[PDB]
Amino acid sequence: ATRIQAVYRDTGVEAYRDNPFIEALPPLQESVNSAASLKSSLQLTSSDLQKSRVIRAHTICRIPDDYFQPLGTHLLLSERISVMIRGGYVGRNPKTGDLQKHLQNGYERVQTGELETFRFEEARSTAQSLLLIGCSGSGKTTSLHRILATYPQVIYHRELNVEQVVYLKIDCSHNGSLKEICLNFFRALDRALGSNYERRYGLKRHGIETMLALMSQIANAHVLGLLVIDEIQHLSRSRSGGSQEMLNFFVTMVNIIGVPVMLIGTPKAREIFEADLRSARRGAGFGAIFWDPIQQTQRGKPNQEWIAFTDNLWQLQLLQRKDALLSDEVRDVWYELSQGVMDIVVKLFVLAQLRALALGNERITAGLLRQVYQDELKPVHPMLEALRSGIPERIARYSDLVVP
Amino acid sequence: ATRIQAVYRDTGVEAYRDNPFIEALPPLQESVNSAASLKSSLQLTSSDLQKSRVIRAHTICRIPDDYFQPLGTHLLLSERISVMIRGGYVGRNPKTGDLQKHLQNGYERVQTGELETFRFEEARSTAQSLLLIGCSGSGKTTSLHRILATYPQVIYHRELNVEQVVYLKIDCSHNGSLKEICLNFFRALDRALGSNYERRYGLKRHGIETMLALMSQIANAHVLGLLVIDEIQHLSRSRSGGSQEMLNFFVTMVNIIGVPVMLIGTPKAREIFEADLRSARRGAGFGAIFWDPIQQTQRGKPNQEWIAFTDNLWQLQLLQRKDALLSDEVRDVWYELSQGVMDIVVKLFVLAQLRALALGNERITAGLLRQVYQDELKPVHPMLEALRSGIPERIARYSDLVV
Amino acid sequence: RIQAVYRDTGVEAYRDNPFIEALPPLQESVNSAASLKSSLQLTSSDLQKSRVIRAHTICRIPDDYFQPLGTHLLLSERISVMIRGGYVGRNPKTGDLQKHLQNGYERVQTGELETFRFEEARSTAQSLLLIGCSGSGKTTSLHRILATYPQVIYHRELNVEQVVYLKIDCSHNGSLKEICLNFFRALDRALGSNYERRYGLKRHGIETMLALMSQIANAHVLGLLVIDEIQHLSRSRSGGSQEMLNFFVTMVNIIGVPVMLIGTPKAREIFEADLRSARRGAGFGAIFWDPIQQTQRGKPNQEWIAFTDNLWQLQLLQRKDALLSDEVRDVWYELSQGVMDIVVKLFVLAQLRALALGNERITAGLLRQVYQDELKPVHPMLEALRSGIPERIARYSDLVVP
Amino acid sequence: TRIQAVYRDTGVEAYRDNPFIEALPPLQTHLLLSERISVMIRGGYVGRNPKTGDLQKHLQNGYERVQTGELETFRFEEARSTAQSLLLIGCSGSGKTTSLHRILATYPQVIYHRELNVEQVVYLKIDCSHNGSLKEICLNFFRALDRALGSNYERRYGLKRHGIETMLALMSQIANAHVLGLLVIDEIQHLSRSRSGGSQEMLNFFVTMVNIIGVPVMLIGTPKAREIFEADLRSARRGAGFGAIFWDP
DNA sequence: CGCGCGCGCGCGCGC
DNA sequence: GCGCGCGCGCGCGCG
Numbered sequence A: 001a002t003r004i005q006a007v008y009r010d011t012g013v014e015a016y017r018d019n020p021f022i023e024a025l026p027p028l029q030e031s032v033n034s035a036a037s038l039k040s041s042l043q044l045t046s047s048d049l050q051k052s053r054v055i056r057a058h059t060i061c062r063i064p065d066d067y068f069q070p071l072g073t074h075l076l077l078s079e080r081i082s083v084m085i086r087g088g089y090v091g092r093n094p095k096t097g098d099l100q101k102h103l104q105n106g107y108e109r110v111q112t113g114e115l116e117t118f119r120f121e122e123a124r125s126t127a128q129s130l131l132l133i134g135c136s137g138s139g140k141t142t143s144l145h146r147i148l149a150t151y152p153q154v155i156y157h158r159e160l161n162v163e164q165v166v167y168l169k170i171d172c173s174h175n176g177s178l179k180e181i182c183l184n185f186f187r188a189l190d191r192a193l194g195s196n197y198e199r200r201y202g203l204k205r206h207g208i209e210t211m212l213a214l215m216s217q218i219a220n221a222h223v224l225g226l227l228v229i230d231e232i233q234h235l236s237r238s239r240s241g242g243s244q245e246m247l248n249f250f251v252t253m254v255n256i257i258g259v260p261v262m263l264i265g266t267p268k269a270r271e272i273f274e275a276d277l278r279s280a281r282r283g284a285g286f287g288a289i290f291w292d293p294i295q296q297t298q299r300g301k302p303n304q305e306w307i308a309f310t311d312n313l314w315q316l317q318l319l320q321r322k323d324a325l326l327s328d329e330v331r332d333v334w335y336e337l338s339q340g341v342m343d344i345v346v347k348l349f350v351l352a353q354l355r356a357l358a359l360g361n362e363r364i365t366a367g368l369l370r371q372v373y374q375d376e377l378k379p380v381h382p383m384l385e386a387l388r389s390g391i392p393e394r395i396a397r398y399s400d401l402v403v404p
Numbered sequence B: 001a002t003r004i005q006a007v008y009r010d011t012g013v014e015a016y017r018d019n020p021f022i023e024a025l026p027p028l029q030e031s032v033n034s035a036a037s038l039k040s041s042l043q044l045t046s047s048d049l050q051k052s053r054v055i056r057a058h059t060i061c062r063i064p065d066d067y068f069q070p071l072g073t074h075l076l077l078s079e080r081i082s083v084m085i086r087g088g089y090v091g092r093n094p095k096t097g098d099l100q101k102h103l104q105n106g107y108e109r110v111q112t113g114e115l116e117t118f119r120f121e122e123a124r125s126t127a128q129s130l131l132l133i134g135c136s137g138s139g140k141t142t143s144l145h146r147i148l149a150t151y152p153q154v155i156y157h158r159e160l161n162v163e164q165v166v167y168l169k170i171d172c173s174h175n176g177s178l179k180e181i182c183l184n185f186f187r188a189l190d191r192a193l194g195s196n197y198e199r200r201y202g203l204k205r206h207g208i209e210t211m212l213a214l215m216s217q218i219a220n221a222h223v224l225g226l227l228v229i230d231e232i233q234h235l236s237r238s239r240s241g242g243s244q245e246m247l248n249f250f251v252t253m254v255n256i257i258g259v260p261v262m263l264i265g266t267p268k269a270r271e272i273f274e275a276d277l278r279s280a281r282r283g284a285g286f287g288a289i290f291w292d293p294i295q296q297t298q299r300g301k302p303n304q305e306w307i308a309f310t311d312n313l314w315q316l317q318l319l320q321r322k323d324a325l326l327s328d329e330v331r332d333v334w335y336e337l338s339q340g341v342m343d344i345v346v347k348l349f350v351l352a353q354l355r356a357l358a359l360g361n362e363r364i365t366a367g368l369l370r371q372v373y374q375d376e377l378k379p380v381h382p383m384l385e386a387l388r389s390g391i392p393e394r395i396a397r398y399s400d401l402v403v
Numbered sequence C: 001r002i003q004a005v006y007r008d009t010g011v012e013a014y015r016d017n018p019f020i021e022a023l024p025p026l027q028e029s030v031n032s033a034a035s036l037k038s039s040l041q042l043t044s045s046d047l048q049k050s051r052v053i054r055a056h057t058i059c060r061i062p063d064d065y066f067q068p069l070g071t072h073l074l075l076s077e078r079i080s081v082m083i084r085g086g087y088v089g090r091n092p093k094t095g096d097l098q099k100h101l102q103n104g105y106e107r108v109q110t111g112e113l114e115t116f117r118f119e120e121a122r123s124t125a126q127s128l129l130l131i132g133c134s135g136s137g138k139t140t141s142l143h144r145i146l147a148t149y150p151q152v153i154y155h156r157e158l159n160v161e162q163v164v165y166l167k168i169d170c171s172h173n174g175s176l177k178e179i180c181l182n183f184f185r186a187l188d189r190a191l192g193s194n195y196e197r198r199y200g201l202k203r204h205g206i207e208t209m210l211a212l213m214s215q216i217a218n219a220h221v222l223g224l225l226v227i228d229e230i231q232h233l234s235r236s237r238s239g240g241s242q243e244m245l246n247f248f249v250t251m252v253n254i255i256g257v258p259v260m261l262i263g264t265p266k267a268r269e270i271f272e273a274d275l276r277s278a279r280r281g282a283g284f285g286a287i288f289w290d291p292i293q294q295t296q297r298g299k300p301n302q303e304w305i306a307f308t309d310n311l312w313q314l315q316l317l318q319r320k321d322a323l324l325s326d327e328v329r330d331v332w333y334e335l336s337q338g339v340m341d342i343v344v345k346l347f348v349l350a351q352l353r354a355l356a357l358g359n360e361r362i363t364a365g366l367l368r369q370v371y372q373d374e375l376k377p378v379h380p381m382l383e384a385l386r387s388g389i390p391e392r393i394a395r396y397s398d399l400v401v402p
Numbered sequence D: 001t002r003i004q005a006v007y008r009d010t011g012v013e014a015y016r017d018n019p020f021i022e023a024l025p026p027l028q029t030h031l032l033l034s035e036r037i038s039v040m041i042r043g044g045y046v047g048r049n050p051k052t053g054d055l056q057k058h059l060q061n062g063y064e065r066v067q068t069g070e071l072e073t074f075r076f077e078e079a080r081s082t083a084q085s086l087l088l089i090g091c092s093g094s095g096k097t098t099s100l101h102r103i104l105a106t107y108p109q110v111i112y113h114r115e116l117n118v119e120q121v122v123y124l125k126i127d128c129s130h131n132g133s134l135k136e137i138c139l140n141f142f143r144a145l146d147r148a149l150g151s152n153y154e155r156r157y158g159l160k161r162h163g164i165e166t167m168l169a170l171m172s173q174i175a176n177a178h179v180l181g182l183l184v185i186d187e188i189q190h191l192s193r194s195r196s197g198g199s200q201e202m203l204n205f206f207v208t209m210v211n212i213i214g215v216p217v218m219l220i221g222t223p224k225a226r227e228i229f230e231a232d233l234r235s236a237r238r239g240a241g242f243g244a245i246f247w248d249p
Numbered sequence E: 001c002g003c004g005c006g007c008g009c010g011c012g013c014g015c
Numbered sequence F: 001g002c003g004c005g006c007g008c009g010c011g012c013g014c015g
């Protein structure tokens, strides 16, 4: 563990009444205020602007890692993860030691008449699942990292020895194998938790069945509240024997041990989720969260969200000949070269900053944007010309590129 | 061993006379009375409307797991399970006591005397089997262990040193291999019965030959009353003739040990029980129960079942500006979207409450319903398009669906 | 090995990180490329020597003659930024941070604060792609770039050994078990160990041996991985071509070791299948190295002129002439047509032919003779570039259209 | 049969105090062939010299000098891989193999180093695949190696139930354990006379061996096998390190 | 501590 | 190009 002792404050939900695993997480935040906490930026003083060439380049190449502007779509994502984690613990409440008294009293009072029936079972799996699908570059990995960074990963409960783990992030196996997802599970858990599960069960020549049972044993021992699997699109194309095997193992994981599972991938992963009704409505239990590139124009006016995003990005420059205000003439060159894909915007900005910084004419203009677009982004050209064209036939040539 | 102390109360069935494992069970109930006791709803007070938005949203998200209304398809299933649990104990009663002198007298009056024929071994495997197949979302698991939770999971006798496991629910194996199904059996047993069978019998490199032997021995020791294997559709994975091995293991388990077995799956498992007459005959050894999406109009008059279901669901709204009664216009487009699937009719309601709650217009209308249908319930559309068309060629493209 | 010393850098975010301060100091781009200059030292006494000795000392020119071009200013900065940014997320920060976590936890749970951020640790790895023609010097250039940094550094304060770069290559049929054996071989060649013997000969699956690769690469914290010749992933059949890229994409996602991929334009189309195979194949841009053109504009290009003038000085002939005629240089580019390796080999073979013929003079006729006689399997593809035809050049995937 | 090494040097800058070079006889259309083979042997021996002494003193002195002093940069790992590979094209009955065997007959095949635990072999001539596959040329490597020197890799790794995978790593390991000066190969027609989609995989192995292992290889064939040296410039450029030698009467 | 048995996986050949 | 059959090696359990 990292030894975060647990402190118990009750919340306003009747279904979370006196649950030790629920009342140990940061309290229920409002929708607007929760997405405000995700706001991050890179700060630079006036002294850092009067620095030499190499230090400025090295500290300006840090923007993609630390700059982050929340979006309106995060208002919907944060609500789901709030109830996924908290809701899955409802059925996994450690029962009071006085449970047998109630059972025996009910049994003796139903046996002799005077009571029609009695519920002899309380524990039942509550866990569910969802599926967020978006084009590559939609900023889903970083968004999930920054949302989950608010939660403490592993805590400790003093009264009874459970070393609760809230979440752990893994990725799908490169060949779609099921006996490799367990090695990633062990590696991620013995990195996040303080243990050596990779040594004990990793190099031993156990079978597929006798190590899946081991992963299921670690997860119910330290209650896991969410397991997130990324790069699901690897199940597509060259899957070894099949993908339905891994899918229905995850289904068993959701239904039996009550650990909610969240799946992440590109819309190349819709080809594995539409073959029958079961593999679709069970693939997403809170529905899907389909993310799309941001558009320059709203229903009847330019999109203000992109305006705020572009302005806040444009404020972060280390060029001495910078222009404080941002014109529409050079703003419109961004969208005609980026099409709203959130990665290309920041990468083009950083690459243009480096080019201007090193060309000797440290002024950013519309010309440098296309000048650096035409050399340093060549292997991604044809996938964005299709988005520029807007014709569905040219868009549908690529599986990741979702038709509008 | 939760140590529920057994109490013996007599019943009215002649064949269930002085059975230790039948008299110590919940008493016989009428199916109409039994189905009425599955009713449940979310507990809401009037003051819950004046609460924080987040708390109200979290309260709404608990609807899918607490609201449950019994339909007309629960009478038959309740009756079948109530007979199937309790008919398998006639051929396993350890009430046999001093059976030496009676057999000796019979032998010594058959070897010489007027008795042409006497019968000695009256033990029989009285078990049966069921096959419950329905659409993915009809409520097989929920209704199954809401019905089956009126029975105590484990009952203990001390006059006879036996621990009785009345039922045990296990899922199938992901790859259709008998090696994984015993690990699930042991985990379910030691997760319900307090014990440690998983480490003792599961991580040693025992072959498949002896692990099944240990499983049979343990199931016979604890007089298991019902084994329910869920997700039986997983056997379509083993297309190298590996489903026959798993099927005949359960057939053997019914013929000798005597535990009744229940099979549950989507209609994609219908390709399993059609290779020969034996599979189909024993797949439904006491009938088969097939479920379908609930229909809006059974006849010219509207169906009262769906009307009652949707009216009872409509009263669980924490939106403040709520309509007093459920309008016919929004009701007719409620079926038009879910098409009778019991999971989607509730998920649409929950997600529309969450959408109107976040948007600020705390009221449910048809337009918002279709907005939520298009935006968020996206991957399930082609199957619902096929169900909306009504033509057989569209439906005969997905294996899960039944015409 | 190297015993670490700690010198602070100018960057505010590269501060207190042991794996960054141990590296050489941040240098400017002008002196980074200028310091990467090599030549062979000669004396006037070598004029009177034997033919065999002269031939053996002039055959060494391609090995130790390196004049930086104008493109190296970008490559040096790119590699330095990648190496120093790889270690940003891989910094030991669990020194006394436990009390900070507990204080923040009790402040968020009970007090007035809400927006605490546990576990600032993450991955900051980005990928680079270098695609150029076979002869553009994309291998010896990278060798000279990373010859500046020490291979492995031993840090005394904690028993951790750091290796900053590792050089492997894709081989044969684009299988992952190629690169596990290659990875172990390179790692235990650079750092004296027996990793290949401990893990190679054993009967091990692909997915179990990749985990050992990941574990050992995370033990000796690796700041860069170079996979040269990724053109072997193109003609290779089955589902291995996409799965090797899958492995390299997930290597820069969890472990954090940045990956740089080097190939020829034959492997230009291994990425063009999808969007994710292209964005995740060039993180900080992709560098395409075109061959030297005769004129950058209406005026002649000074890069080629400087190259020829500096390369001309490395001659050892009795009747040698320091000056060179314009006719000599004009046919020099005509025969080779932009590809630098062919230039240096044509020069050295012409010098060898002149030395052994008995005529101690270099002339354009001898250059044409050594072009025709020796470079027989090289010219049928140089003809397309010499003729300047778009389709003739576009016949092959080895050479880009312009 | 192995002979002791007599280290006699000559007035050359590149070859100096490197035991793998001065353990060879004195340096002083067949003239070009002999000169080319000699220079590849010695240049390939250059890039693998373990003649270094107290590197750690020098390396740490340079590190400390760069970290604080006025010296710009220090060039760590001055260890290259000097390998070159020509193509030899000529008809089978012309007599190319006669000159080949005459030139490689001049130098001793295997020599002995006593101060170092290395017994390097100057040349190692295997024949190309008769059926045509990746495996048999590497088995041929074991057979030629154990014919050259008293060895038993034919039993340990020749017919051992391994794959096409681990055999290659062992072959490279035993190649650079006794560093080869030349890997000369004849009859390259059957490389692509028959195939299974893997005609260029053997050339991929050759390129990898002349990149990391650092052994200069030689390829010999009749004008039939020129098809693979025409498809793309990577194979065409690497197919002629010092330039191809087409044989004429 | 040595030998016997079984099981898991890897490679080659056949369809 | 994929599935099945065989063979090889390793590990644990018992006397």
Ligand SMILES: Nc1ncnc2c1ncn2[C@@H]1O[C@H](COP(=O)(O)OP(=O)(O)NP(=O)(O)O)[C@@H](O)[C@H]1O
Pocket: A063, A064, A065, A066, A067, A068, A069, A070, A071, A135, A136, A137, A138, A139, A140, A141, A142, A143, A342, A343, A346, A347, C280
């Ligand atoms: N909300 C955001 N604000 C600013 N930059 C962002 C945001 N989201 C993503 N980025 C940038 O997007 C780049 C990488 O996006 P990333 O999150 O890796 O894509 P991804 O879809 O989540 N993973 P992948 O499957 O490879 O596309 C980085 O440069 C981030 O700075």
Ligand SMILES: Nc1ncnc2c1ncn2[C@@H]1O[C@H](COP(=O)(O)OP(=O)(O)NP(=O)(O)O)[C@@H](O)[C@H]1O
Pocket: A278, A282, B064, B065, B067, B068, B069, B070, B071, B135, B136, B137, B138, B139, B140, B141, B142, B143, B266, B342, B343, B346
């Ligand atoms: N009578 C009912 N009243 C209320 N909700 C119901 C009813 N029947 C089913 N549901 C809901 O339908 C959803 C599906 O439940 P579930 O138990 O998964 O059925 P299922 O058929 O086993 N799904 P699957 O295992 O994939 O076939 C749940 O959200 C239940 O709450």
Ligand SMILES: Nc1ncnc2c1ncn2[C@@H]1O[C@H](COP(=O)(O)OP(=O)(O)NP(=O)(O)O)[C@@H](O)[C@H]1O
Pocket: C062, C063, C065, C066, C067, C068, C069, C133, C134, C135, C136, C137, C138, C139, C140, C141, C228, C229, C263, C264, C340, C341, C344
């Ligand atoms: N800057 C340079 N100045 C002089 N010669 C150079 C230079 N760069 C490369 N060369 C020549 O190129 C040789 C090595 O580069 P080269 O073999 O072409 O690598 P590469 O072909 O680009 N990488 P690859 O084709 O994937 O193996 C050197 O020995 C030189 O002869």
Ligand SMILES: [Mg+2]
Pocket: A140, A141, A230
């Ligand atoms: Mg991602």
Ligand SMILES: [Mg+2]
Pocket: B140, B141, B142, B230
């Ligand atoms: Mg179910």
Ligand SMILES: [Mg+2]
Pocket: C138, C139, C140, C228
């Ligand atoms: Mg190279």
